[PDB]
Structure 1
Amino acid sequence: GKISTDKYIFLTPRAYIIVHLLKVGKAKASEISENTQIPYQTVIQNIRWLLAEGYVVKEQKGEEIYYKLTDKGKQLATAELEKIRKLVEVVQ
């Protein structure tokens, strides 16, 4: 699929999406988009995926939808986080 492109040379859109949640805790798609500088359509499309694999869960308050990492989500993230660290250490 469309993994490595000019905009995504090293990290994929999800990398930015997840990392953003690790900080804000919970945020809307619109939030994720404008903050990570990623076109909305790419965000929700990725969110759906994360929702399929239990990495993220919804949070409806009638009108406003919030997304947040699941325990296995944060599990995925430190794991990938440390892997990055590894890559950046061998390299330099």
Structure 2
Amino acid sequence: YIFLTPRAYIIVHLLKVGKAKASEISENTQIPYQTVIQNIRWLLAEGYVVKEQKGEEIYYKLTDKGKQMATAELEKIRKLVEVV
């Protein structure tokens, strides 16, 4: 995690997948379970992510504010690649 934080991976995973459980995010991003949960709390607190209960499970998905933040962040990264 030199350049990127675990939140970057968590957010980017939700972009292409849409909705995902904490366990699922953890496995696909190879970020420990507890770490994912901790980061999800921050994302929820900031209004970037929202919970969606499907039966006895808890899924997560980006909000409109979360999708604009991801897009804006990815575009700034792309510019960093250009300049560098």
- Which TM-score band applies after superposition, normalised by the shorter structure? over 0.9
Which of the numbers 62, 73, 86 marks the counterpart of 2:79?
86
- Distance, in Å, in 1 between the alignment partners of 2:54 and 2:15 is 21
Task: Decide which structure has greater strand share.
Answer: 2
Q: Secondary structure at the match of 1:58?
A: strand
Deviation (angstroms), 1:62: 3.3
What is the percent sequence identity of the aligned residues? 99
**Deviation above 4 Å: which 4+ runs of structure 1?**
none
- Hey, what's the Cα distance between the residues in 1 that align with 2:35 and 2:69? 20
Q: Of the two, which has the highest radius of gyration? A: 1
5+ residue gaps, structure 1: 1-7
Higher RCO (C-alpha 8 Å, min separation 6): 2
> For 1:78 and 1:85, how far apart are their aligned partners in 2?
10
Instruction: Structure 2: give runs of 5+ residues left out of the alignment.
Output: none
Show the counterpart of 1:33.
Answer: 26
- Displacement of 1:61: 2.2
Query: Could you report, residue by residue, the CA deviation over 1:63-92 in whole angstroms, capped at 9, with x for unpaired residues?
Result: 11100000000010010000000100001x
Instruction: Give the number of equivalent residue pairs.
Output: 84
More helix by proportion, 1 or 2? 2
